[PDB]
Amino acid sequence: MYAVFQSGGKQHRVSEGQTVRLEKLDIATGETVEFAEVLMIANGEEVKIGVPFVDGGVIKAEVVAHGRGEKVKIVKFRRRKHYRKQQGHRQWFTDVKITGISA
Amino acid sequence: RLNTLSPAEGSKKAGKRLGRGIGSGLGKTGGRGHKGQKSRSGGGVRRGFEGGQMPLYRRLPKFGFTSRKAAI
């Protein structure tokens, strides 16, 4: 029981009952999210997409966390040119829990 | 309210500090460039000096005189 869907420009392989950290979405922290753009629905028998976004498949997930990613330091330094620059970044994420996969 | 008085916006510049870090901008000779007469402490040419060329106040001629009557 697993499916592949594209949400934030990248495809995620998720099975039933597991949480996946994906790109932040303008959505509430406790509202079920619907993703009708699913690439494959997998079972004992395999069904493949003759055209993108299957025919009636959809992914039902619930948002869990809306925090930020780990600290990453961006250090730019030029050798012998009296130049160095410091910068930090923390990419936002919206963790969701995959609770239901349709056919 | 004594600890509330603040200066008007734009009334302070904070100045410029030379030779203080890399991100401060004008450091490492702080805005006077690499080797040269200007880069040395106490350097620079006197007023009107044109690197040996005759200054304007030397190439131009004198004319007229100061009249004491005009001062009274």
Curated annotation (Swiss-Prot), chain A:
UniProt keyword annotations, A-Z: Ribonucleoprotein, Ribosomal protein, RNA-binding, rRNA-binding
GO molecular function: rRNA binding; structural constituent of ribosome
PROSITE patterns in the record: RIBOSOMAL_L21
Residues passing through the membrane, by range: none
InterPro entries reported in the protein's UniProt record: bL21-like, bL21-like_sf, Ribosomal_bL21, Ribosomal_bL21_CS
Subunit structure as annotated in this protein's UniProt entry: Part of the 50S ribosomal subunit. Contacts protein L20.
Function of the protein: This protein binds to 23S rRNA in the presence of protein L20.
Name used for this protein in its record: Large ribosomal subunit protein bL21
Species the sequence originates in: Escherichia coli (strain K12)
Swiss-Prot record, chain B:
Gene Ontology BP annotations: cytoplasmic translation
Superkingdom per UniProt: Bacteria
GO CC term, one of those recorded: cytosolic large ribosomal subunit
UniProt entry keywords in alphabetical sequence: Ribonucleoprotein, Ribosomal protein, RNA-binding, rRNA-binding
Location of the region described as Disordered in the Swiss-Prot/TrEMBL record: 1-53
Family affiliation: Belongs to the universal ribosomal protein uL15 family.
Name used for this protein in its record: Large ribosomal subunit protein uL15
Shown segment, full-protein numbering: 2 to 73 of 144
